[PDB]
Enzyme design. Structure first.
Site, PDB file in Angstrom:
ATOM      1  N   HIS B  96       0.822  -1.240   0.000  1.00  0.00           N
ATOM      2  CA  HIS B  96       0.000   0.000   0.000  1.00  0.00           C
ATOM      3  C   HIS B  96       0.844   1.273   0.000  1.00  0.00           C
ATOM      4  CE1 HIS B  96      -2.676  -3.076   1.901  1.00  0.00           C
ATOM      5  NE2 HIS B  96      -3.391  -2.693   0.860  1.00  0.00           N
ATOM      6  N   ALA B 179     -14.699  -6.172  -3.235  1.00  0.00           N
ATOM      7  CA  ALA B 179     -15.136  -5.803  -1.893  1.00  0.00           C
ATOM      8  C   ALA B 179     -16.575  -5.301  -1.909  1.00  0.00           C
ATOM      9  CB  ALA B 179     -14.207  -4.724  -1.265  1.00  0.00           C
ATOM     10  N   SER B 220     -22.068   6.373 -10.895  1.00  0.00           N
ATOM     11  CA  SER B 220     -21.440   7.217  -9.887  1.00  0.00           C
ATOM     12  C   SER B 220     -21.044   8.622 -10.357  1.00  0.00           C
ATOM     13  CB  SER B 220     -20.195   6.522  -9.367  1.00  0.00           C
ATOM     14  OG  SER B 220     -19.704   7.272  -8.293  1.00  0.00           O
ATOM     15  N   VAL B 239     -13.722   1.592  -3.086  1.00  0.00           N
ATOM     16  CA  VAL B 239     -13.152   2.042  -4.343  1.00  0.00           C
ATOM     17  C   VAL B 239     -11.637   1.694  -4.448  1.00  0.00           C
ATOM     18  CG1 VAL B 239     -12.452   4.213  -5.399  1.00  0.00           C
ATOM     19  CG2 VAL B 239     -14.875   3.802  -4.963  1.00  0.00           C
ATOM     20  N   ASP B 270      -6.742   1.367   3.819  1.00  0.00           N
ATOM     21  CA  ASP B 270      -5.381   1.013   3.405  1.00  0.00           C
ATOM     22  C   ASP B 270      -5.389   1.767   2.120  1.00  0.00           C
ATOM     23  OD1 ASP B 270      -6.868  -0.363   1.454  1.00  0.00           O
ATOM     24  OD2 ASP B 270      -6.111  -2.339   2.030  1.00  0.00           O
ATOM     25  N   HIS B 327      12.904 -19.875  -8.883  1.00  0.00           N
ATOM     26  CA  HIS B 327      13.570 -19.190  -9.993  1.00  0.00           C
ATOM     27  C   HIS B 327      14.255 -17.874  -9.593  1.00  0.00           C
ATOM     28  CE1 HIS B 327      11.070 -21.545 -13.169  1.00  0.00           C
ATOM     29  NE2 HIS B 327      10.697 -21.980 -11.979  1.00  0.00           N
TER      30      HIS B 327
HETATM   31  N1  LIG Z   1      -6.918  -3.427   4.437  1.00  0.00           N
HETATM   32  C1  LIG Z   1      -8.114  -4.016   4.305  1.00  0.00           C
HETATM   33  O1  LIG Z   1      -8.865  -4.475   5.406  1.00  0.00           O
HETATM   34  C2  LIG Z   1      -8.682  -4.217   2.936  1.00  0.00           C
HETATM   35  C3  LIG Z   1      -8.867  -5.512   2.492  1.00  0.00           C
HETATM   36  C4  LIG Z   1      -9.232  -5.716   1.169  1.00  0.00           C
HETATM   37  C5  LIG Z   1      -9.422  -4.645   0.306  1.00  0.00           C
HETATM   38  N2  LIG Z   1      -9.248  -3.367   0.766  1.00  0.00           N
HETATM   39  C6  LIG Z   1      -9.464  -2.238  -0.134  1.00  0.00           C
HETATM   40  O2  LIG Z   1     -10.775  -2.215  -0.647  1.00  0.00           O
HETATM   41  C7  LIG Z   1     -10.804  -1.415  -1.811  1.00  0.00           C
HETATM   42  C8  LIG Z   1     -11.612  -2.108  -2.908  1.00  0.00           C
HETATM   43  O3  LIG Z   1     -10.835  -3.187  -3.394  1.00  0.00           O
HETATM   44  P1  LIG Z   1     -11.403  -4.239  -4.455  1.00  0.00           P
HETATM   45  O4  LIG Z   1     -10.534  -5.433  -4.575  1.00  0.00           O
HETATM   46  O5  LIG Z   1     -12.878  -4.343  -4.244  1.00  0.00           O
HETATM   47  O6  LIG Z   1     -11.134  -3.373  -5.770  1.00  0.00           O
HETATM   48  P2  LIG Z   1     -11.656  -3.677  -7.250  1.00  0.00           P
HETATM   49  O7  LIG Z   1     -10.562  -3.207  -8.135  1.00  0.00           O
HETATM   50  O8  LIG Z   1     -12.054  -5.084  -7.525  1.00  0.00           O
HETATM   51  O9  LIG Z   1     -12.936  -2.707  -7.373  1.00  0.00           O
HETATM   52  C9  LIG Z   1     -12.873  -1.329  -7.118  1.00  0.00           C
HETATM   53  C10 LIG Z   1     -14.014  -0.673  -7.863  1.00  0.00           C
HETATM   54  O10 LIG Z   1     -14.035   0.708  -7.543  1.00  0.00           O
HETATM   55  C11 LIG Z   1     -14.496   1.402  -8.688  1.00  0.00           C
HETATM   56  N3  LIG Z   1     -14.172   2.841  -8.714  1.00  0.00           N
HETATM   57  C12 LIG Z   1     -12.948   3.426  -8.999  1.00  0.00           C
HETATM   58  N4  LIG Z   1     -13.099   4.773  -8.942  1.00  0.00           N
HETATM   59  C13 LIG Z   1     -14.391   5.064  -8.625  1.00  0.00           C
HETATM   60  C14 LIG Z   1     -15.078   6.268  -8.452  1.00  0.00           C
HETATM   61  N5  LIG Z   1     -14.456   7.430  -8.592  1.00  0.00           N
HETATM   62  N6  LIG Z   1     -16.421   6.260  -8.141  1.00  0.00           N
HETATM   63  C15 LIG Z   1     -17.076   5.044  -8.000  1.00  0.00           C
HETATM   64  N7  LIG Z   1     -16.403   3.844  -8.190  1.00  0.00           N
HETATM   65  C16 LIG Z   1     -15.079   3.853  -8.487  1.00  0.00           C
HETATM   66  C17 LIG Z   1     -13.858   0.661  -9.855  1.00  0.00           C
HETATM   67  O11 LIG Z   1     -14.541   0.913 -11.065  1.00  0.00           O
HETATM   68  C18 LIG Z   1     -13.891  -0.778  -9.381  1.00  0.00           C
HETATM   69  O12 LIG Z   1     -15.022  -1.448  -9.888  1.00  0.00           O
HETATM   70  C19 LIG Z   1      -9.325  -1.234  -2.175  1.00  0.00           C
HETATM   71  O13 LIG Z   1      -8.928   0.024  -1.711  1.00  0.00           O
HETATM   72  C20 LIG Z   1      -8.592  -2.278  -1.368  1.00  0.00           C
HETATM   73  O14 LIG Z   1      -7.297  -1.871  -0.995  1.00  0.00           O
HETATM   74  C21 LIG Z   1      -8.881  -3.136   2.064  1.00  0.00           C
END
Ligand SMILES: NC(=O)c1ccc[n+]([C@@H]2O[C@H](COP(=O)([O-])OP(=O)(O)OC[C@H]3O[C@@H](n4cnc5c(N)ncnc54)[C@H](O)[C@@H]3O)[C@@H](O)[C@H]2O)c1
Ligand SMILES: NC(=O)c1ccc[n+]([C@@H]2O[C@H](COP(=O)([O-])OP(=O)(O)OC[C@H]3O[C@@H](n4cnc5c(N)ncnc54)[C@H](O)[C@@H]3O)[C@@H](O)[C@H]2O)c1
Ligand SMILES: NC(=O)c1ccc[n+]([C@@H]2O[C@H](COP(=O)([O-])OP(=O)(O)OC[C@H]3O[C@@H](n4cnc5c(N)ncnc54)[C@H](O)[C@@H]3O)[C@@H](O)[C@H]2O)c1
Ligand SMILES: NC(=O)c1ccc[n+]([C@@H]2O[C@H](COP(=O)([O-])OP(=O)(O)OC[C@H]3O[C@@H](n4cnc5c(N)ncnc54)[C@H](O)[C@@H]3O)[C@@H](O)[C@H]2O)c1
EC number: 1.4.1.1
Lengths: 371, 371, 371, 371
Positions: B96, B179, B220, B239, B270, B327
């Site tokens: 991150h 998520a 959105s 997001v 994160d 590798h």
């Molecule tokens: N540390 C934690 O507990 C934890 C764990 C898992 C994921 N996460 C976070 O959750 C977030 C989501 O991850 P994910 O795997 O679902 O991502 P993903 O890439 O599968 O999906 C993210 C979505 O957000 C959308 N998006 C981007 N910009 C946008 C905007 N301006 N308006 C509306 N939608 C928008 C994208 O189109 C995409 O569909 C990430 O930031 C990831 O780091 C945090």
């Protein structure tokens, strides 16, 4: 007739036994409604909202209890209130008498006439005034169970619904009635694998039909109950025989054989608890330990979502409140057999057979008080 | 080659970066596996289970960091660990970097070579190593959101799913990726009415198809986002733009106009947070107030259900861990373009363009380190 | 006994009160069946089909009315038919007497004996002869509502189900009985977001169980009713108190605060209308305007799908037709309390209490006509 | 660059090619937006709403056509508009050139440069600008089909979903793409039994998976097509070969063997019609007869629900409008191969191969216009 609603005094009890719509209907019919100031504050109903509907606000609890012919409450009289119990007064609330001799004795000694929300029973056997609180608590039990399953809260650290590739939590619900069905439905919606036990096979048939195969059903024999509880991450006890104490179905020796960090939620705690180890707890101190498991035993569960539960309760109670207010208790009870079945107490006489049998003597009088 | 796994040191971090099955595979291939004693305790994996699979247990963290050519972690190096960073070592964990100048700086300064789990990206655009943690987090968000909506926790006191005759909670999910789909799915299963927003219409089409009409989808734009968030009881921010900081989509002035006691769960914490008021919190102090709403911002979410998440994580990472160990890093990255996309750091060079542009200068080097 | 079926004369009424299978059963039992030539043509049943089953075809309406002991119809006698009403004759049809002083008076003055389909009621409270027409009309209401929401027909121009990224129509159904349940089910199937209101919480429970969370339920208080109708694109009135006039639930002042182009379908128009502004319309001129909304008020709804609705009706009515033909009206009514409940009119006496209290005087006789 | 949007002139066309949010984006980037006064009125967007976003309102159509470098429309230029077509101007709209020799010729003779929404195609084969209009039209087709099945509108008089004990309508959908999938989904949601045919088996697989067994799938051979259409009450043609004319799949001889009162909706009418007897109709005269069946052939379908369809369209088109405005047509087309695929016309050259082979001569030039 004069209808009073005091502020609920039980720990963290945010509900109120009436809303403005109900006040409005009473006053329209010529009854006077007295309300302790601040009684609706837990549920976000201001003193002003009550006023506007025609209620007289009163500064203290004491003046609601004296004065009121019909006292509407949510919870049972607490010790500090035993002295407020009057002889020529109708009490209409949740009582759970089979679980409290002290409350029962206080009602009998004061000569008050009391009707239990939870034993009002229609001809088909439904409990229309408990039902809505059983819905809220059934749904709540799955949420709080889910939350306490986290390591962070002392649970075994499994996610309700798992994720692809990894097994979900194993949830067992004892009792396929209103609360059990709702607990199972929410638990299943969060992805858990759910098994529900009951002695009534028809209740299991409806559950089987409603979810096709998704919710598993098992006949609640001793063998089958032990097998399921042994394997469970979350156990929810949702058992009832309408006015009775509540059987002890899960023994302490059984819990000794459970996975460490399992959680047990005893919805049947009002009414006695269906786990041997159960004891009423409060939202301030909701849980306690029994051999490596975590017990959750809040009597009064619906209180934490008052925005939902206050409305759900009063939507159900109002038509009965109106029958009482217009006709007085006997007559209301002669006209309405379901209200009759809620009759618990009158001038020192115990009017409910299940309560009487479970409490040892008292001894019943049936409904020759209805003359 | 020598593979090291230390105990996770972040607050309430119960996961471990490897399981016995993985150790056994590494060993069978002739690699040595060094594990800090007690590293698997959070996940109920005993030192004995690790030995049986062929791991050498080591008494202290320091011996794992020195000695190991490939260092497997779950979380980013925290300050106390900056001094353990070595020059000729591969670090594979969740980084991150766009959200921490300090951690990026420490990786650059130490000359370590680092691969981020969260930027390993397949041709189709999927993020297979983040995906399982987004699954756990998405499902957790619904759960913890439902719990904090109780008056008892500072929320507005509505039950997720309502009960018959009374409206359910209103849930908005921003982001329809892994998520957000998962948060939406669980919220819906608990009976909430759910609206999800994304800029990607195809993501919205999939969600529409999967639930027929049940989950509402909104494009959105600013207007649509404000409308939805104003009415929401629970807002879940999910997001991502894969390696980037994360846009601030919900401003403090917007939250000033929300219902009192609303809860906002920022899964995108994160990575930076997608609410203006977000700030990383811990399982010990998960929430804080912003204008009458309650914010929940645990970085680190999957940690509380380690029995689920440790398996979900390592099921996905293991094949990549094997490619690296057999590798070495360059060559593994020459062979596997998905791994190459995770390359973040090498000998003082920042290898990730998104991180670089967001962090201000540094300045990219692409993968002419792959020669 | 002689059973007559005339051609329906109301505007666009394509149903017929009997099918060939029914004629054949009557004939087999030794009864005569007289049918106006062309009576089945709207439902694609030829004169030849009726002959083959044992029916006597008759050239004119007059000869069916004179001659027939039991006169089977679908709709109430219209004014041009008042002169055909006879003294020693049983009329079995839909009557809706509480909505027509004129039709009631004409039955009273003629001395005819009349049984209403819509008040035939079994012990459990069901209305088995209304039910199949409420199923048709409930399903029709969602269809025709969907259609008139197009800008092209005067509606606001929203698609029932929306499309991914754009909100669906907001539909409110008042009444959760047979027609309301059916309207909600079809509206939901078209992707609309559906809320249903009723004063009967158990009906709300059934609907919550059947669709899990998908159909929203709201308790029908004045506050909840206003809130929902104000926000709706489509309102369906499906309210029903068995033999009574039908409460005005939606005032004109309320409709003045609705979104422009909203559509209101009043299924409860036979029976009087549950919207203040309602008035019976026909399939030739189905709609009219009220403050920028569009009202749809076809009494008669099932007539447009006679292929479905003729069979649905006669499948339900036949067993009752058979009891009447075999035993005569009293005796059939002595044996079958459900049939007795449909007794409306005999030799100038009004036999229905609900109709009598709504129409002011007349005055009841109960069923001391059953001797 | 200067972007113009004129009022749509086709019969009952209530859509507009841009919304205020789109105007605001264009303006923010330094472009001029010229809009015919009243252009947004069909979709409830006022002249004031457009001004507030930065638009110059213009009194007449002529001034939008002259002046604008980029002309954004919804429908193809109609004959009264042929004279407005200019040499150094980009036209971006729905064209359907293979269905109109006249419109094609007018674009060729005028030298205008034209890009068709319906042929903008991404690498995976999707048509992202058609798609939202196929969703609207597919959902509309089931609605309007349901409606015209009433005897009252000339149909056979069957209710889509039947009622318990009586059979539902039999619906066939030809084409399992965006519009076909959407028509099937709504038809099914209304309780009809639905069969869909396609030559692409993978599309059949997706539809089988999404609804488990509920939507029937049939491989589209001539034998299977005849069998299904012969038995149908409602036939929906939704067939699509991206820029081509559209095969005649249902002959007049076939329609002669259909049940009387059957309804055929030809969604593929823009593009030419997939029924032999099809001919473009309008919302003022939507239907005509062919051998006892009723044809519904509105080119233009989404226009009746502009509140839904204007937003659905412009949500998809805006990113492409932005690329064109910022970079000009070639360059935008050099950078974006999806946009290049929409290139239809430039300085008298026909740039689409499918249109060229269908229209006989013209003759292609490929995209050596991109230099
Ligand atoms: N540390 C934690 O507990 C934890 C764990 C898992 C994921 N996460 C976070 O959750 C977030 C989501 O991850 P994910 O795997 O679902 O991502 P993903 O890439 O599968 O999906 C993210 C979505 O957000 C959308 N998006 C981007 N910009 C946008 C905007 N301006 N308006 C509306 N939608 C928008 C994208 O189109 C995409 O569909 C990430 O930031 C990831 O780091 C945090
Ligand atoms: N205070 C609170 O927070 C709260 C709120 C609501 C309900 N409750 C309690 O929840 C419990 C259940 O409520 P309900 O409304 O669902 O009751 P219910 O009447 O709907 O269901 C009871 C079910 O339990 C079953 N049962 C009885 N004995 C059993 C046995 N030996 N083994 C398995 N099943 C058995 C019955 O067959 C029945 O189906 C009650 O004790 C009620 O008081 C508590
Ligand atoms: N002529 C036609 O085309 C046609 C056909 C069938 C039915 N209908 C009419 O549809 C109406 C509904 O009939 P049904 O068979 O569904 O009846 P039903 O009895 O099954 O249900 C009617 C529902 O209305 C509810 N209700 C009563 N008062 C209410 C109140 N004030 N607020 C909210 N809900 C209330 C009842 O609780 C009941 O659940 C009746 O008037 C019937 O005559 C018209
Ligand atoms: N003007 C309007 O109101 C309106 C709006 C939108 C779409 N449409 C039309 O609807 C039609 C369908 O569009 P879509 O977006 O669904 O297209 P699509 O490409 O997504 O799907 C069309 C389907 O037709 C199938 N097909 C092609 N040849 C076939 C054959 N001979 N037999 C059976 N199936 C065959 C294809 O395999 C494809 O799956 C197009 O003509 C489109 O222009 C009209």
């Amino acid at each position: 007739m004069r209808v009073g609603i005091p502020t609920e005094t039980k720990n963290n009890e945010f509900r109120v036994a009436i809303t403005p719509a109900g006040v409005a209907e009473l006053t329209r019919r010529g009854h006077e409604v007295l309300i302790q100031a601040g009684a609706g504050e837990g549920s976000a109903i201001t003193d002003a909202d009550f006023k506007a509907a025609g209620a007289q606000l009163v500064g203290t609890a004491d003046q609601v209890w004296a004065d009121a012919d019909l006292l509407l409450k949510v919870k049972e009289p607490i010790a500090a209130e035993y002295g407020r119990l009057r002889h020529g007064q109708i009490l209409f609330t949740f009582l759970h008498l089979a679980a409290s001799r002290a409350c029962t004795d206080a009602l009998l000694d004061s000569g008050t006439t009391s009707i239990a929300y939870e034993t009002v029973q229609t001809a088909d056997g439904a409990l229309p005034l408990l039902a809505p609180m059983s819905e809220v608590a059934g749904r709540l039990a799955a949420q709080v169970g889910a939350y306490h399953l986290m390591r962070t809260q002392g649970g075994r650290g499994v996610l309700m619904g798992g994720v692809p590739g990894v097994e979900p939590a194993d949830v067992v619900v004892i009792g396929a009635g209103t609360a059990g069905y709702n607990a199972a439905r929410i638990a299943n919606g969060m992805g858990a694998t759910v098994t529900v036990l009951d002695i009534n096979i028809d209740k299991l048939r409806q559950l089987d039909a409603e979810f096709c195969g998704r919710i598993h059903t098992r006949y609640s024999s001793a063998y089958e109950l032990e097998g399921a509880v042994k394997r469970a991450d979350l156990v929810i006890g949702a058992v009832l025989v309408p006015g009775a104490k509540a059987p002890k179905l899960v023994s302490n020796s059984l819990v000794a054989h459970m996975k460490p960090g399992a959680v047990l939620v005893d919805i049947a705690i009002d009414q006695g608890g269906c786990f041997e180890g159960s004891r009423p707890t409060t939202y301030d101190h909701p849980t306690f330990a029994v051999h490596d498991t975590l017990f959750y035993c809040v009597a009064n569960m619906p209180a934490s979502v008052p925005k939902t539960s206050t409305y759900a309760l009063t939507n159900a109670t109002m038509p009965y409140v109106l029958e009482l207010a217009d006709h007085g208790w006997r007559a209301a009870c002669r006209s309405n057999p379901a209200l009759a079945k809620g009759l618990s107490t009158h001038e020192g006489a115990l009017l409910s057979e299940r309560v009487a049998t479970d409490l040892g003597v008292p001894f019943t009088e049936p409904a020759s008080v209805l003359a």
